[PDB]
Amino acid sequence: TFVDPVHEFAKELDATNISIDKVVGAGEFGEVCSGRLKLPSKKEISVAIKTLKVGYTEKQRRDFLGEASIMGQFDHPNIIRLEGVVTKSKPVMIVTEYMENGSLDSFLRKHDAQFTVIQLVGMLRGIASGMKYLSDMGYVHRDLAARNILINSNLVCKVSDFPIRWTSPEAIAYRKFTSASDVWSYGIVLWEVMSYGERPYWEMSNQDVIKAVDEGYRLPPPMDCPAALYQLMLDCWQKDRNNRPKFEQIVSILDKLIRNPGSLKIITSNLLLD
């Protein structure tokens, strides 16, 4: 079980063991970079590093470190791993798993139509597995989107980031956030992946995204989308949250498609009334 909130769930790292190789850019609370971490066993690994800005407010420190207090509760191959934090020296740091290929949406946009269906399904199965664990822990992510999935050198996808287009109708209507609203979001991610990082609902007015979805309109099948995967999207997007599949069922569905790849050969900016 997830416990809503740092030292309980995050290792305090010795800054001697951290080196910075490359500055990426500016994050919400400070800088973002990458480098290397020397583990207690002397093994050396690549890591992502983010710092808290100089002259931070106490609120900024709390919100920044709050990420670590959440992330550190999870230990799963499809959830970004927290290596630890540095708090006893400044700048304050959060050190996480290095993901060579960055955010999934931007990665797929650079590789439009260049992966096999089975490769895409493998990415999707990893995301679903991470979400099955989060939901098993009682954690509702609320921001599941391809931009919040990171992808490593071997194309393994992992949930990160601990949004009307990704949010279920009931969560928009009255803030009813549950694991079933994360399943809705997963359906949007499925569409994003099969579309190679197209933006869900493109740049439709937010009021129209809300109204169209409420009226029963859904994102259309991506080009060359397997029927099984478009149906899975529609199932994730059931109006009745109780009729959406559970994450365990989504993992099982994708596992069957991986085991029977011939099933994927059956092929299915305007919205379709569902």
- At 210, which CATH number? 1.10.510.10
Report the distance separating Cα 131 and Cα 144, nearest Å: 9
Number of folded domains that form the chain:
2
Question: Is 214 found in the same domain as 81?
Answer: no
Question: Is 267 found in the same domain as 181?
Answer: yes
**Last residue within a domain, chosen from 81, 98, 115:** 98
DSSP 244: S
For 177, 189, 195, the CA distances from 264, given in Å and listed in that order, are 32, 18, 16
Question: Is 268 found in the same domain as 195?
Answer: yes
Question: Is 106 found in the same domain as 82?
Answer: no
Annotated binding residues for ATP, written as ranges, equal: 24-32, 50
Question: Is 115 found in the same domain as 200?
Answer: yes
Other CB atoms within a 10 A radius of the CB of residue 41 amount to: 6
Question: Is 86 found in the same domain as 109?
Answer: no
**Last residue within a domain, chosen from 33, 64, 98:** 98
75 is known as an active-site residue: no
Encoded tokens for 255: 């596992």
Residues 6+ apart with CB under 8 A from 93: 13, 15, 18, 49, 50, 51, 52, 85, 86
Documented resolution in Å: 1.2
Picking from 188, 198, 84, the residue whose alpha carbon sits closest to that of residue 127 is 188
CATH value at residue 83: 3.30.200.20
Question: Is 253 found in the same domain as 133?
Answer: yes
Strand order in the sheet with 44-51: 18-26, 31-38, 44-51, 93-97, 82-86
Q: What is the rounded radius of gyration, in angstroms, for the C-alpha atoms of the chain? A: 19
Domain that holds residue 18: 1-98
**Residue of 63, 143, 235, 274 marked active site:** 143
Decide if 179 contacts 135 (C-beta within 8 A). yes
Decide if 218 contacts 180 (C-beta within 8 A). no
Residues 6+ apart with CB under 8 A from 3: 73
**Last residue within a domain, chosen from 56, 72, 98:** 98
* Strand blocks (E) in the chain: 18-26, 31-38, 44-51, 82-86, 93-97, 149-151, 157-159, 217-218, 272-273
Expt. technique: X-ray
Question: Is 47 found in the same domain as 153?
Answer: no
Question: Is 186 found in the same domain as 116?
Answer: yes
Encoded tokens for 103: 């955010």
Question: Is 109 found in the same domain as 220?
Answer: yes
Question: Is 133 found in the same domain as 193?
Answer: yes
Question: Is 61 found in the same domain as 103?
Answer: no
Picking from 48, 31, 49, 47, the residue whose alpha carbon sits closest to that of residue 39 is 47
Annotated binding residues, written as ranges, equal: 24-32, 50
Identity at 123, one-letter amino acid code: M
